[PDB]
């Protein structure tokens, strides 16, 4: 009896959502001139990692950035002068993510260790030392992001997320409800909501303050690899192992126009927007990073690394864009 | 040059960092990395604790054989699905699989696990060093005769020991041993197109020669890879 009620309620939901689409984005868009072609050149090349590169994260001042590798190192670079400011050796050799604090006082990392570590950069001594170690998860860490100097949001492989308190080191909220393991999360500019995409081919919306899911989005038939969040705050884009990426809206609660090409077979690994939201930067599996028009489903340009492009990043001021790859090279583009 | 007084110290510090990184790079290329897989019943813990002589995710172990360094990573408290984190281990030298052959009950799931590992797309071009552990319990339980294999594997009745058998104990236990080996090798040799190989063994509960066996198998693996690269094999 309960199953039938759930089925009819789901049917009612999809029917109510169905009677809301009157026009497609493409026909409204047809009255907009295309952006044309985009040309970017490799300004700088940062070298020094041994193994593959899996993560990177820009700084807020738009100069410094941090990257992670499988040999067990974190390196903080000076983008303008290519110098190296720091080099941090890790306890565990298998890491999957890194984050760089908004104030620039801390960095974090995690991986096949079920532990998130916090590193203090500005000390009375001249060395960088670990501050906290946040244990309590079961599966491998796949993402982590800073709220402020005391709050951090983690994504794990045991199909749960969590909100932590760095001062004490105890969880204050656990977000449960994903069927498969979750891989990526993105925050909002107003730091009140965040999304997360998992391997059950669905993405969910969460409320940080009170801590329960508000909306659930579907449409992909394979697992979700990357998720980014629109600069306005009312949309987001996902990236799947289906060689396809979609755009969803938080009010219409529907799949808007999708970006797919007939010459792509491999899934994507990273997604990011530009400052104005006109461009969509996607890192692919066939050694390439394509550039999409976020309104017309056109390939404005191509960014061509000798192995998989694993990570991306766009500066706060929009001046540059960095890419990482499994050949252990970081390139800065504009 | 146009650099300031405080910009030369920055490049000096960067150069010292690069020197340290190059030293670490030289250290990193003389080490071989291994991945250890198995089930809870199989004695992974016993062999890993012998070779060296909380809900953590990985455990790391080091051992030295003939001035060669080996890294053997054991994946610990994870979930029941391995499809996602298995892509990180596509550059190791070899995979080690441990099987408990005394049970006969949960031994069919072991074959499925081995098939899943062998047929993985991210794990091709990587060889497997099969370990067949817990032989003394096998012998004790078969000589008693309380449990019969035919009750679990009815094909065991119509099987005869191979001519290649070299039992260096009994005229029957060897039939069961080589039956289990034949099952695993029948799974192994169904495909593989000559890019990775399987090396069965007869490890016991306590042994002092596992490291030497791993050394020899890794030597053979890398030598075959090099010969194939230069078109000599």
């Amino acid at each position, epitope marked *: 009896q309960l199953r039938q009620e759930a089925e009819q309620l789901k049917n009612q939901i999809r029917d109510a959502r169905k009677a809301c689409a009157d026009a497609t984005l493409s026909q409204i868009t047809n009255n907009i001139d295309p952006v044309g072609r985009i040309q970017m050149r490799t300004r700088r090349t940062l070298r020094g990692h041994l193994a593959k590169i899996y993560a990177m994260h820009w700084g807020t001042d738009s100069r410094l950035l941090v990257s992670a590798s499988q040999d067990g190192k974190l390196i903080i670079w000076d983008s303008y002068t290519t110098n190296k400011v720091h080099a941090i050796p890790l306890r565990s050799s298998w890491v999957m993510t890194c984050a760089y604090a908004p104030s620039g006082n801390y960095v974090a990392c995690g991986g096949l260790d079920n532990i998130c570590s916090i590193y203090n950069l500005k000390t009375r001594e*001249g*060395n960088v030392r670990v501050s906290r170690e946040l244990a309590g998860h079961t599966g491998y860490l796949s993402c982590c992001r800073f709220l402020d100097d005391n709050q951090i949001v983690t994504s794990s492989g045991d199909t749960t997320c969590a909100l932590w308190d760095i001062e004490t080191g105890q969880q204050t909220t656990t977000f449960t409800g994903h069927t498969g393991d979750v891989m990526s999360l993105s925050l909002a500019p107003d730091t009140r909501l965040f999304v997360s995409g998992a391997c059950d081919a669905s993405a969910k919306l969460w409320d940080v303050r009170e801590g329960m899911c508000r909306q659930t989005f579907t449409g992909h038939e394979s697992d979700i690899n990357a998720i980014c969040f629109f600069p306005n705050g009312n949309a987001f884009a996902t990236g799947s192992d289906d060689a396809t990426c979609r755009l969803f809206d938080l009010r219409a609660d529907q799949e808007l126009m999708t970006y797919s090409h007939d010459n792509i077979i491999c899934g994507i690994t990273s997604v990011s927007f530009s400052k104005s939201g006109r461009l969509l930067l996607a890192g692919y599996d066939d050694f390439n990073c394509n550039v999409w028009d976020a309104l017309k489903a056109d390939r404005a340009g191509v960014l061509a690394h000798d192995n998989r492009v694993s990570c991306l990043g766009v500066t706060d001021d929009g001046m540059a864009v960095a890419t990482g790859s499994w050949d252990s090279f970081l390139k800065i583009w504009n | 040059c146009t650099l300031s007084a405080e910009d030369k110290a920055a490049v000096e510090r960067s150069k010292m960092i690069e020197k340290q990184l190059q030293k670490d790079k030289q250290v990193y290329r003389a080490t071989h990395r291994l991945l250890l897989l198995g089930a809870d019943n199989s004695g992974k813990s016993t062999i890993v604790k012998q070779m060296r002589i909380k809900t953590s995710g990985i455990f790391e172990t080091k051992f030295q054989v003939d001035k060669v360094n080996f890294h053997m990573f054991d994946v610990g408290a994870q979930r029941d699905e391995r499809r996602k984190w298995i892509q990180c281990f596509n550059d190791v030298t070899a995979i080690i699989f441990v099987v408990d052959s005394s049970d006969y009950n949960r031994l069919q799931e072991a074959l499925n696990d081995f098939k899943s590992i062998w047929n993985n797309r991210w794990l091709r071009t990587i060889s497997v060093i099969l370990f067949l552990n817990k032989q003394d319990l096998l012998a004790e339980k078969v000589l008693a005769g309380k449990s019969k294999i035919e009750d679990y594997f009815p094909e065991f009745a119509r099987y005869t020991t191979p001519e290649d058998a070299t039992p260096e104990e009994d005229p029957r236990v060897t039939r069961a041993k080589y039956f289990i080996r034949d099952e695993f090798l029948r799974i192994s040799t169904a495909s593989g197109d000559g890019r990775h190989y399987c090396y069965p063994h007869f490890t016991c509960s306590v042994d002092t020669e596992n490291a030497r066996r791993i050394f020899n198998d890794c030597r053979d693996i890398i030598q075959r890879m090099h010969l194939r690269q230069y078109e000599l094999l």
Partner: single-chain antibody
Framework: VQLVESGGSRKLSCSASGFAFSSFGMHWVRQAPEKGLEWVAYISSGSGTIYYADTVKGRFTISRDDPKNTLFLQMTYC??????????????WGQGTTLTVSSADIVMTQATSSVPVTPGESVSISCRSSKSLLHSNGNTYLYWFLQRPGQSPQLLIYRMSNLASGVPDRFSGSGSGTAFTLTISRLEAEDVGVYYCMQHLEYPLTFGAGTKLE
């Protein structure tokens, strides 16, 4: 952090204990009995670069011993300094042993020498250099130290605008390229002392003259 030294043809030693001595460059700075500060020598972190004061070059020699965390100066204040993007050099000074010894460089003079003030009122102190300290990259290398009557000098401002770590937020810095000023909004009894002016565009780190506050 606490580096305390005692010594004094003669040899001087400065011993450090409390921080990563191997990541910091070191300096030696001289103070005459009745005259402002003066620079002597400098040794890099990796011992790859060494400079000496133009006045004495053949009679002096510096060396460092990283394993035992000791600094040396040979007769024939020891100050930390670390350089990278966003660092604060000259932040910590030693307990103090002065070194009384019996052209094209940048010279700068402070306008006055003394001024009487009253608590609760703002004060201004001026410095002026021969040539512009603003560089092509954008940094303006100016430092304020504010030695107190009895102790070693401290650090207040670096790069003419950035406030130090532990100093109260009553100090500020501003300038235009050649003329600079330091303003103290409020005032307390702990601000009594003499203030110094420094440049870091070139190796001869020419200090200023001093401005006593009574």
């Amino acid at each position: 952090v606490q580096l305390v030294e005692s010594g004094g043809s003669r040899k001087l030693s400065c011993s450090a204990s409390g921080f990563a001595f191997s990541s910091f460059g070191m300096h030696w700075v001289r103070q005459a009995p009745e005259k402002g500060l003066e620079w002597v020598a400098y040794i890099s972190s990796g011992s790859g670069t060494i400079y000496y004061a133009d006045t004495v070059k053949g009679r002096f020699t510096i060396s460092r011993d990283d394993p035992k965390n000791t600094l040396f100066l040979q007769m024939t204040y020891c100050v930390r300094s670390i350089y990278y993007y966003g660092s604060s050099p000259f932040d910590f000074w030693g307990q103090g042993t002065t070194l009384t010894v019996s052209s094209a460089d940048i010279v700068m003079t402070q306008a006055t020498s003394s001024v009487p003030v009253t608590p609760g009122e703002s004060v201004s102190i001026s410095c002026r250099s021969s040539k512009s300290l603003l560089h092509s990259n954008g940094n303006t290398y100016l430092y304020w130290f504010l030695q107190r009557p009895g102790q070693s000098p401290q650090l207040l401002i670096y790069r003419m605008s950035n406030l130090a770590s532990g100093v109260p937020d009553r100090f500020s810095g501003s300038g235009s390229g050649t003329a600079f000023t330091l303003t103290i909004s409020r005032l307390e009894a702990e601000d009594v002392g003499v203030y110094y002016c420094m440049q870091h565009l070139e190796y001869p780190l020419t200090f200023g003259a001093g401005t006593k506050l009574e």
